[PDB]
Amino acid sequence: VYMLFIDIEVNGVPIKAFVDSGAQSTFMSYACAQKCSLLRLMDTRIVGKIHLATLKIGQRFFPSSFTVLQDNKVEFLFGLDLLRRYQCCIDLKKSVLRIDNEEIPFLDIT
Amino acid sequence: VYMLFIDIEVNGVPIKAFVDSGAQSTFMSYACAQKCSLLRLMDTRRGVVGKTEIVGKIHLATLKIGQRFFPSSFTVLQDNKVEFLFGLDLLRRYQCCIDLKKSVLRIDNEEIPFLSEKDIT
Amino acid sequence: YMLFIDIEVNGVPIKAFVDSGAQSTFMSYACAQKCSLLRLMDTRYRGVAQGVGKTEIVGKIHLATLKIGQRFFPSSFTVLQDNKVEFLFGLDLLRRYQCCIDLKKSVLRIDNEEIPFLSEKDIT
Amino acid sequence: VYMLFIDIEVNGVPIKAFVDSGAQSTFMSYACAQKCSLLRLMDTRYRGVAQGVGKTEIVGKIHLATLKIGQRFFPSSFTVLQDNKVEFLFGLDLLRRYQCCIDLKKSVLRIDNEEIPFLSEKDITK
Amino acid sequence: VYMLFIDIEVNGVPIKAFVDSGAQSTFMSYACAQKCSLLRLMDTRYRGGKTEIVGKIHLATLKIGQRFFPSSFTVLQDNKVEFLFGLDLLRRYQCCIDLKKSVLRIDNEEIPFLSEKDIT
Amino acid sequence: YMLFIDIEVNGVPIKAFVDSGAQSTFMSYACAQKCSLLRLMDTRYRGVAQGVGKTEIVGKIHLATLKIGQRFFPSSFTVLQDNKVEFLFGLDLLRRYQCCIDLKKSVLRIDNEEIPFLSEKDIT
């Protein structure tokens, strides 16, 4: 998998999520916020905070809070906040993210 | 466990390993290299504002995680961020699972617990 | 003052800058936003951060419908952050459709059809 | 034909001319100017003291030189630059002056009535 | 003595200490910390030029002249000087910077300021 | 919080910052204006290559009379735009008068005479 990515959807839009256990906080790029029509949901705090958005990871939907930044390092960084909030396993034997009992396979990058 | 740490040993020396799925490459600080007496063990090596370039590479050091021993290669840096950064290279090389349900690193079939906030600053 | 053509991409009117010196066709991110093509992209990118200029690839549109004259053309192009020009019609597409830049008649001859180059009023 | 090139001769010297409809002005490199013995033909007309950061701007202008494209000869005005990126850039100025057609069907430049073929990758360096 | 330097020792290692009454705080270069093997002693306290703060040495043994002194200092990545002897330590040991005799008088003992040869 | 002394330059009371780490003595332009020394100056400066502070040199006062305690001293210094301190008493003058910065007694001993370092209240 070379670096760890997952397919997720935010507000219905397909997104490649970078799985980083070393990041305290989940971020989405401003450009990704623009692509997902989430700009209308923003804060006055770093571009702003999304207080709640719908994530579709596998077959299940998750309520999520994250920060929007101007940096396009990745479109979406799935950080330790969300990793632990949904009690995930980063399984590099099976190459999957196991969230609830469900396994989401690691990715489709260039 | 506000960040993921594990207790491991390199060449017999107890170390706190920072577990980072977002790092392509495993690094150890020069100070930790000094504490593990691995300075004499080095290699040559990055072309021509950060990441602190390189001191050298350790071709092999033996890691003890749980009751099992692992061969490792990593880079030594002057960067003091953490004593040892357990990156995606080693995470996948030993086919680890970062289990945040049970709060353990499952390496072979064995489970190594993530350290409490007390064990860290 | 340079060569422009009126085209449409996914139904949106565009002024295309005709450049035989460019290996690749590009559209600005702002034009990509105007044409609602942000969700239409790839993982196309420019390595890790060496070269000192322009800006770099935002992503690639694998296929989009171009309307030039009366005829419709399938196209691929890259999106960039630089707004220098909204759309650069490059040598990739110039040769893909075997276009002729006719500066005698001042037309782009795509197939047998001729598209006139724009007058300075049709440009700002 | 990884880009569009033509064989031309300027002041008798064989050159590979890069055909660019997106350049407002025809340019020759200083090195090409020296190899074509055009240096004794130069002017003081230049790019001032307000500058950019990269393009090594203007050495001077050649008010007229003979181009041989195919069997015909053409009078030409162009600018010399220090940038050796390409030897000679045949720009929109000259493209329109001789009412050229860039034919990518036949892979030729049609300039007065004659057709001049675009160069193969062999005729161009590594 | 184109600036004021003193010979001192930290954890046994000879160092050239730059005497600065204008610096609130004593600092050592990371390079000097490495050469003195004080790396295993670092708190790793930071701040939220001279590449800012690496970490703090809460206590290290300084030999100035024939006496030994307990010292606290910060380590920085800046190589400006190997060791900056600041006002903190200057006053803590009630030193006199004597430019008549060209000495640092720490206790009753006098440590001579170094000749330009002993420096670049 | 630091070492200050009361001095006079050309008759004007000044708070002098004592810095053994500074090679050269400097005075701010505002202090030069307060000491009526602006018309008395030279064309001294530091070239073309620099850093991102110190505000560079305005010029040199070749001689000004310093009163430290009961005794009077000839001095040279540079004027800067920087208001870091009004007057920085550097190693040049520290050694020129063979001063002792005595932190046991908290005094500057310039000859046999001792000038006390200022209390935090005497600083603003």
Numbering used by the authors:
A (entry chain E): 296 to 340, 353 to 414, 418 to 420
B (entry chain F): 296 to 340, 342 to 344, 348 to 420
C (entry chain D), F (entry chain A): 297 to 420
D (entry chain C): 296 to 421
E (entry chain B): 296 to 343, 349 to 420
Anything the authors wrote about it?
Ddi1 is a multidomain protein that belongs to the ubiquitin receptor family of proteins. The Ddi1 proteins contain a highly conserved retroviral protease (RVP)-like domain along with other domains. The crystal structures of the RVP domains of Ddi1 from T. gondii and C. hominis were determined; they form homodimers similar to those observed in HIV protease and the reported structures of the same domain from Saccharomyces cerevisiae, Leishmania major and humans.
Out of the six dimers in the ASU, the flap regions of both the subunits in only one dimer and the flaps of three other subunits in different dimers had electron density. The flap of ToxoDdi1-RVP forms a loop without the characteristic β-hairpin structure. The distance between the Cα atoms of Val348 residues located at the tips of the two flaps is 11.5 ​Å. The distance between the Cα atom of Val348 and the Cα atom of Asp315 (catalytic aspartate) is 21.6 ​Å in one subunit and 21.2 ​Å in the other. The MD simulations showed that RMSD values of the flaps of subunits A and B stabilized at about 5.5 and 6.5 ​Å, respectively.
